[PDB]
Amino acid sequence: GTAFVVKLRGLPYAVTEQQIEEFFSGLDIKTDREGILFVMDRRGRATGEAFVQFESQDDTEQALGRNREKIGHRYIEIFRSSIAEMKRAT
Secondary structure (H helix, E strand, O other): OOOOEEEEEOOOOOOOHHHHHHHOOOOOEOOOOOOEEEEEOOOOOEEEEEEEEEOOHHHHHHHHOOOOOEEOOEEOEEEEOOHHHHHHHO
8 A cells, every 4th residue: 555656846836736636537536635745844844746645556556647747837756755754754
C-alpha cells in the first residue's frame, strides 16, 4: 500500500481537489483527507506540488501514464512516490 502514491508538479495557482479528481477521472483516489494533499511552504503558500493516494497499484500506474497531460493550460508532471514521502512533506 505504501507505494500507491504519486507526486504532482506544475499545478495551476487556483487548483482545486475537483480539478485533481477530474485529471485522474477513472482512477480510484482515496476518499479521506489524505487522498489529495497540496504541498505548502513554511508559511502556508502553495508550491504547485501535490500528493495523490490511490486504492490500487494498477491505478498508480495509470496515473503515471498521464504524465504531462494538462489541467487548464498547465502541464502536470507526475512522479512515483510513497506514503512516507507524502507524510513528510505534509
